[PDB]
Design a protein around this ligand. Sequence first.
Ligand SMILES: CCCCCCCC(=O)OC[C@H](COP(=O)(O)O[C@@H]1[C@H](O)[C@H](O)[C@@H](OP(=O)(O)O)[C@H](OP(=O)(O)O)[C@H]1O)OC(=O)CCCCCCC
Ligand SMILES: CCCCCCCC(=O)OC[C@H](COP(=O)(O)O[C@@H]1[C@H](O)[C@H](O)[C@@H](OP(=O)(O)O)[C@H](OP(=O)(O)O)[C@H]1O)OC(=O)CCCCCCC
Lengths: 227, 227
Amino acid sequence: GDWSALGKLLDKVQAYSTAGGKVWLSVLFIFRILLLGTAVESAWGDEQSAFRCNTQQPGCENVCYDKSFPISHVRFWVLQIIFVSVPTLLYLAHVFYVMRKEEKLNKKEEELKMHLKQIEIKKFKYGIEEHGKVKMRGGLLRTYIISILFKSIFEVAFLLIQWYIYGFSLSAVYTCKRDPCPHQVDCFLSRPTEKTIFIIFMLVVSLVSLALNIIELFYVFFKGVKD
Amino acid sequence: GDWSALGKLLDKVQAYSTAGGKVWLSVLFIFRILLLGTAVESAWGDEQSAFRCNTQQPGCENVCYDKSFPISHVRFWVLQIIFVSVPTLLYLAHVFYVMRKEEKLNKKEEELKMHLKQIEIKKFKYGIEEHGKVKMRGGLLRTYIISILFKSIFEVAFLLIQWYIYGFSLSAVYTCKRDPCPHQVDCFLSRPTEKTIFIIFMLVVSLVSLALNIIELFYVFFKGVKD
Ligand SMILES: CCCCCCCC(=O)OC[C@H](COP(=O)(O)O[C@@H]1[C@H](O)[C@H](O)[C@@H](OP(=O)(O)O)[C@H](OP(=O)(O)O)[C@H]1O)OC(=O)CCCCCCC
Ligand SMILES: CCCCCCCC(=O)OC[C@H](COP(=O)(O)O[C@@H]1[C@H](O)[C@H](O)[C@@H](OP(=O)(O)O)[C@H](OP(=O)(O)O)[C@H]1O)OC(=O)CCCCCCC
């Protein structure tokens, strides 16, 4: 694949994050990315060539396959993985902006050495005191919360879309009724059992990730209330 | 074919018959027998090999053909021709019995030459006077009438059966729904137009024959009333 850039960026962002965020990144790296690339994507290797129908009408097989699978599961999961990673990058960008502000303020104070008072109050407001121990307060906390909410809503929306379109199982026999197939025809899928097992596994993984980020949000809210 | 024996017997029986009976025998020989043997039977030469359906399920073609054609038209017409010829043979047998009685009575009278009175009354009762001019009176008339009625009822029964089973036309496309064919399949006949034309022609011929024998019955009833 080509997941090198996204993996590198996630490795860059995982340095400064909460424990729940680190666990979420770890499970995303292990189960969502590694498992799909290694063995899951090989199952959908001949979902088109092994598909066949019980007719001799030309062109009915392509129409029935297009009717049966509007979009492959592997591509759907890739799109989901892409769409549940942007807000972390947004948080990384905001952290880098905070770092730039810290560097400029440090340069100004080094130049200086009531200005000290305002420099210190600005360094405390952004949570930059130890030169490498950026804390979450004011803006970073807001960005983190909105990122968590966006990730959760994207995941639940994708789950609902998948539930509406396909369901959570693949029957061994599919009934096709569309031109130019005369009347109704019978078509047979390929590897229904493995696909059902992997779909259930991915559903479980998605639910676990949802619960994990919910726990992370609750913990960060409690930490904010602590102050 | 093997119609030689029946044709010979009909040639034997046509010697002594009414004009309507002779015309009926002529039309039966010309249109019913000659036409069917010459060209009509060749049309149903590949009604099985040219039949095909739009499926690749093994054994569906035979089942659909058996569903479509319970009995071929040619065999039905042959059976009809056979079943609308027996009563003429029965009349021929009765005429031969009358001839035997005439020969025995002639032998007895030649032996003799009040007995003359009874011989003459028996020769008049059976209508045997001129030694070769047998007339219809008493028993022959009854046999002729019952033969005509039996022929008419057989013909109308066969016509009704054909109307109930097939109809009077063959559509170019037939819909088949029977195991092991999955759902419904489309099957295509062979030479629908020629078969429809010949079916209509045979129906017209049968109606003409029915009208002819009705006219013959009316004429013979009038002749009987004449006495
Ligand atoms: C049931 C758990 C409920 C809490 C779950 C909390 C989340 C969880 O499960 O792991 C993350 C957590 C915090 O780790 P993290 O390094 O971020 O935080 C440490 C500590 O918990 C305080 O946050 C700070 O020290 P102190 O306290 O001011 O001296 C300081 O962090 P910070 O403030 O400078 O950033 C750290 O010493 O790890 C723990 O071991 C918590 C202690 C209890 C671990 C044992 C379980 C009670
Ligand atoms: C509209 C027709 C209505 C009648 C249709 C009648 C049926 C029809 O169309 O053809 C058969 C018919 C009878 O022929 P067939 O030879 O059986 O009978 C002749 C005749 O008609 C009488 O029956 C008898 O003679 P006669 O009269 O006693 O001297 C004698 O027969 P039979 O008694 O010994 O067995 C015969 O001379 O032929 C005709 O030419 C009828 C005369 C009219 C022909 C012209 C048309 C009027």
